[PDB]
Design a protein. Sequence first.
Length: 210
Amino acid sequence: EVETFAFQAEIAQLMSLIINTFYSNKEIFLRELISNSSDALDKIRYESLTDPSKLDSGKELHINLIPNKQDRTLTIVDTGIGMTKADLINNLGTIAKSGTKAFMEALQAGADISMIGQFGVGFYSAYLVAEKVTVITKHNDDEQYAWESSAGGSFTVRTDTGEPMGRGTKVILHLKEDQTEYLEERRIKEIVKKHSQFIGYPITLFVEKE
Ligand SMILES: CN(C(=O)c1cccs1)[C@@H]1C[C@@H]2C=C[C@H]1C2
């Protein structure tokens, strides 16, 4: 059972601006997604101080970067707090409406796409490099869900039947054909060192077996 939803109009306009604007500095997408993972890890770390049982679904707090040249995917996995169904369908998009409006005003005033994280809508920079994004997520208070979108104004949410995650979020970037540099180990290392060197959780870059 797959449910299909329209993006709010502002968010659809934002993703079309991200997909259609000429902007060469695409690598900032990785900083934004790692920043999101770090925030999610911060959240479960704080909550577990007053309720240790929140870590029953996994005590390790980390971020894994998993390129896959065969599937042409880059996966960012964290063991943070995860996202509920209502987060996916309504809450986070509602919050993103004001930040989207502010970011688009700033872009008219001379800002540039690299500043997107200062508005809280950095996730959508994934569409700088990805033609489709799948998000698998598990919150302690809800079931495991798959969110997916190829832009175009709509997204889907379904219950996930894949491997159980425990707790956290997995962002699967289905990369555009000309963005496969972000599958290369030395390129990912360079980007993490440049933009994410002080993230307070272990970031493990998986290497490919082939
Ligand atoms: C995956 N995703 C996130 O990881 C975060 C965005 C902002 C803070 S976390 C989002 C959930 C909903 C589905 C995709 C977007 C909107």
